[PDB]
Scaffold this active site. Structure first.
Site, PDB file in Angstrom:
ATOM      1  N   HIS A 177       0.817  -1.227   0.000  1.00  0.00           N
ATOM      2  CA  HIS A 177       0.000   0.000   0.000  1.00  0.00           C
ATOM      3  C   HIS A 177       0.841   1.263   0.000  1.00  0.00           C
ATOM      4  O   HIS A 177       0.365   2.282  -0.485  1.00  0.00           O
ATOM      5  CB  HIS A 177      -1.074   0.013   1.121  1.00  0.00           C
ATOM      6  CG  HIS A 177      -0.567   0.433   2.471  1.00  0.00           C
ATOM      7  ND1 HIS A 177      -0.246  -0.495   3.440  1.00  0.00           N
ATOM      8  CD2 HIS A 177      -0.389   1.675   2.984  1.00  0.00           C
ATOM      9  CE1 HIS A 177       0.170   0.194   4.487  1.00  0.00           C
ATOM     10  NE2 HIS A 177       0.110   1.504   4.261  1.00  0.00           N
TER      11      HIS A 177
ATOM     12  N   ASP B 126      -0.692  -7.359   1.520  1.00  0.00           N
ATOM     13  CA  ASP B 126       0.015  -6.089   1.669  1.00  0.00           C
ATOM     14  C   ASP B 126       1.516  -6.259   1.925  1.00  0.00           C
ATOM     15  O   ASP B 126       2.019  -6.056   3.038  1.00  0.00           O
ATOM     16  CB  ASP B 126      -0.681  -5.234   2.737  1.00  0.00           C
ATOM     17  CG  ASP B 126      -0.254  -3.791   2.750  1.00  0.00           C
ATOM     18  OD1 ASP B 126       0.317  -3.337   1.749  1.00  0.00           O
ATOM     19  OD2 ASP B 126      -0.431  -3.141   3.783  1.00  0.00           O
TER      20      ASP B 126
ATOM     21  N   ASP C 261       0.083   1.217  19.837  1.00  0.00           N
ATOM     22  CA  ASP C 261      -0.139   0.739  18.475  1.00  0.00           C
ATOM     23  C   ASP C 261       0.895   1.332  17.552  1.00  0.00           C
ATOM     24  O   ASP C 261       1.544   2.300  17.920  1.00  0.00           O
ATOM     25  CB  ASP C 261      -1.553   1.165  18.009  1.00  0.00           C
ATOM     26  CG  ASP C 261      -2.140   0.470  16.801  1.00  0.00           C
ATOM     27  OD1 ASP C 261      -1.455  -0.428  16.219  1.00  0.00           O
ATOM     28  OD2 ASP C 261      -3.263   0.841  16.403  1.00  0.00           O
TER      29      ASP C 261
ATOM     30  N   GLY D 198       2.186   6.056   9.547  1.00  0.00           N
ATOM     31  CA  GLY D 198       3.562   6.386   9.188  1.00  0.00           C
ATOM     32  C   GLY D 198       4.575   5.278   9.445  1.00  0.00           C
ATOM     33  O   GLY D 198       5.741   5.396   9.052  1.00  0.00           O
TER      34      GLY D 198
ATOM     35  N   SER E  21       3.879   2.174   8.468  1.00  0.00           N
ATOM     36  CA  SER E  21       3.536   1.247   7.379  1.00  0.00           C
ATOM     37  C   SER E  21       4.787   0.713   6.701  1.00  0.00           C
ATOM     38  O   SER E  21       5.719   1.492   6.440  1.00  0.00           O
ATOM     39  CB  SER E  21       2.650   1.937   6.344  1.00  0.00           C
ATOM     40  OG  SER E  21       1.372   2.221   6.891  1.00  0.00           O
ATOM     41  N   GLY E  22       4.827  -0.607   6.518  1.00  0.00           N
ATOM     42  CA  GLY E  22       5.933  -1.301   5.868  1.00  0.00           C
ATOM     43  C   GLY E  22       7.045  -1.714   6.808  1.00  0.00           C
ATOM     44  O   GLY E  22       7.902  -2.496   6.424  1.00  0.00           O
TER      45      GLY E  22
HETATM   46  N1  LIG Z   1      -1.469  -0.594  13.425  1.00  0.00           N
HETATM   47  C1  LIG Z   1      -2.278   0.354  12.904  1.00  0.00           C
HETATM   48  N2  LIG Z   1      -3.296   0.795  13.735  1.00  0.00           N
HETATM   49  C2  LIG Z   1      -4.156   1.710  13.266  1.00  0.00           C
HETATM   50  C3  LIG Z   1      -4.105   2.230  12.007  1.00  0.00           C
HETATM   51  C4  LIG Z   1      -3.091   1.805  11.108  1.00  0.00           C
HETATM   52  C5  LIG Z   1      -2.991   2.334   9.800  1.00  0.00           C
HETATM   53  C6  LIG Z   1      -1.962   1.964   8.965  1.00  0.00           C
HETATM   54  N3  LIG Z   1      -1.845   2.489   7.684  1.00  0.00           N
HETATM   55  C7  LIG Z   1      -2.796   3.323   6.969  1.00  0.00           C
HETATM   56  C8  LIG Z   1      -2.080   4.086   5.836  1.00  0.00           C
HETATM   57  O1  LIG Z   1      -0.974   3.697   5.470  1.00  0.00           O
HETATM   58  N4  LIG Z   1      -2.689   5.163   5.325  1.00  0.00           N
HETATM   59  C9  LIG Z   1      -2.258   5.794   4.085  1.00  0.00           C
HETATM   60  C10 LIG Z   1      -2.535   4.937   2.873  1.00  0.00           C
HETATM   61  C11 LIG Z   1      -1.746   5.028   1.734  1.00  0.00           C
HETATM   62  C12 LIG Z   1      -2.006   4.234   0.626  1.00  0.00           C
HETATM   63  C13 LIG Z   1      -3.067   3.344   0.635  1.00  0.00           C
HETATM   64  C14 LIG Z   1      -3.867   3.240   1.764  1.00  0.00           C
HETATM   65  C15 LIG Z   1      -3.589   4.028   2.878  1.00  0.00           C
HETATM   66  N5  LIG Z   1      -4.992   2.377   1.764  1.00  0.00           N
HETATM   67  C16 LIG Z   1      -6.232   2.650   2.239  1.00  0.00           C
HETATM   68  O2  LIG Z   1      -6.556   3.728   2.728  1.00  0.00           O
HETATM   69  C17 LIG Z   1      -7.243   1.547   2.064  1.00  0.00           C
HETATM   70  C18 LIG Z   1      -6.938   0.252   2.795  1.00  0.00           C
HETATM   71  C19 LIG Z   1      -7.018   0.281   4.323  1.00  0.00           C
HETATM   72  C20 LIG Z   1      -5.911   1.017   5.038  1.00  0.00           C
HETATM   73  C21 LIG Z   1      -6.209   1.955   6.015  1.00  0.00           C
HETATM   74  C22 LIG Z   1      -5.210   2.685   6.626  1.00  0.00           C
HETATM   75  C23 LIG Z   1      -3.878   2.491   6.297  1.00  0.00           C
HETATM   76  C24 LIG Z   1      -3.573   1.514   5.356  1.00  0.00           C
HETATM   77  C25 LIG Z   1      -4.575   0.793   4.730  1.00  0.00           C
HETATM   78  C26 LIG Z   1      -1.003   1.051   9.405  1.00  0.00           C
HETATM   79  C27 LIG Z   1      -1.082   0.502  10.650  1.00  0.00           C
HETATM   80  C28 LIG Z   1      -2.125   0.849  11.551  1.00  0.00           C
END
Ligand SMILES: Nc1nccc2cc(N[C@H]3C(=O)NCc4cccc(c4)NC(=O)CCCc4ccc3cc4)ccc12
Ligand SMILES: [Ca+2]
Lengths: 250, 55
Positions: free
Chosen positions: A41, A90, A182, A186, A188-189
């Protein structure tokens, strides 16, 4: 990372910082001198594929101390099953143009074999999650690498304990439902690292969740054990023109 | 054999025909003569933190 602590410099040497046009994009995990594992993502909104940089040995974003190593990302490999804007599959495999030089500050995390990860690593309750993500939901990101110790849950227990996308076989739940601790968007990855008999292994990837540290919700992580053979085969392949590569999964 | 306590292996386990079990290690490690333990063959083996390993 919400409710964690600063990772002492050099204590997360496999942590990768991914940059696009010099701007913080995502985390990643070094698994050998050429390859980084991250989240698919992270690349949904990329247009400047030639300006992706992976930084190894990073700790503090405000200062350069000489331990940082930068590499252009030559390839970004994503499974054919991943659909941009969704949650499942992902995972991204990144090839660095040149190898990084391992030092006290740059060391890969062990990519385990599948059976060992499914039968042994899956049952180690606590693991470390790390990154320079949000310190609070809708808050500033960290300037110093943060780390948090989180407990893993069986998906049945996760679904039961949670207040929405499906938690598939390519995912696992970890963290707390009390809104205190949590990983965030930011992070992510970034790695979900598991200790077993003196060695650390890659078991998960910071993937998705419902707002950072939201009460009644846990963090969702990519179940790396499902991709071991997919990753191993791709690491044996020659690169192809173009940065982005969609590779068939399984 | 591998199914019970990782076959006693510190890292990876492989089952063979009969009662035979082989332990294996990640790249950057070699198997000790006890047939279960893994020792680094390199200065920076995967999954070890040098600053903690040195102190
Ligand atoms: N442990 C955690 N706790 C709470 C929230 C969290 C949120 C995360 N990531 C965010 C993120 O990266 N947001 C920017 C983004 C960029 C490009 C694509 C997407 C999101 N995708 C979506 O919004 C549609 C799928 C669903 C999705 C929703 C949020 C995310 C990723 C995927 C990662 C870990 C998390
Ligand atoms: Ca720095």
């Amino acid at each position: 990372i919400v409710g964690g602590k600063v990772c002492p410099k050099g204590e997360c040497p496999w942590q990768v910082l991914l940059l696009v046009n010099g701007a913080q994009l995502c985390g990643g995990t070094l698994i050998n001198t050429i390859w980084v594992v991250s989240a698919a993502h992270c690349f949904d909104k990329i247009k400047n594929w030639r300006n992706l940089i992976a930084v190894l040995g990073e700790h503090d974003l405000s200062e350069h101390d000489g331990d940082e190593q930068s590499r252009r990302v030559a390839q970004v490999i994503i499974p054919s099953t991943y659909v941009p804007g969704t949650t499942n599959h992902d995972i991204a495999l990144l090839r660095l143009h040149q190898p990084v030089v391992l030092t006290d500050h740059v060391v890969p995390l062990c990519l385990p074999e599948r059976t060992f990860s499914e039968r042994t690593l899956a049952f180690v309750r606590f693991s470390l999650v790390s990154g320079w993500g949000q310190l609070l939901d809708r808050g500033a990101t960290a300037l110093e690498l943060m780390v948090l110790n989180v407990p893993r849950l069986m998906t049945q227990d996760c679904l039961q304990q949670s207040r929405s996308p499906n938690i598939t076989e390519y995912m696992f739940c970890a963290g707390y439902s009390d809104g205190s601790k949590d990983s965030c968007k930011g992070d992510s990855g970034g790695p979900h690292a598991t200790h077993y008999r003196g060695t650390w292994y890659l078991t998960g990837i910071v993937s998705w969740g419902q707002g950072c540290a939201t009460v009644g919700h846990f963090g969702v992580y990519t179940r790396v054990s499902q991709y071991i053979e997919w990753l191993q085969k791709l690491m044996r392949s020659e690169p192809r023109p173009g940065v982005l590569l969609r590779a068939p999964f399984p | 054999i591998c199914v019970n306590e990782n076959g006693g292996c510190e890292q990876y386990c492989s089952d063979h025909t009969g009662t035979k079990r082989s332990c294996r290690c990640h790249e950057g490690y070699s198997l000790l003569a006890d047939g279960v333990s893994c020792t680094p063959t390199v200065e920076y083996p995967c999954g070890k933190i040098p600053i903690l390993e040195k102190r």
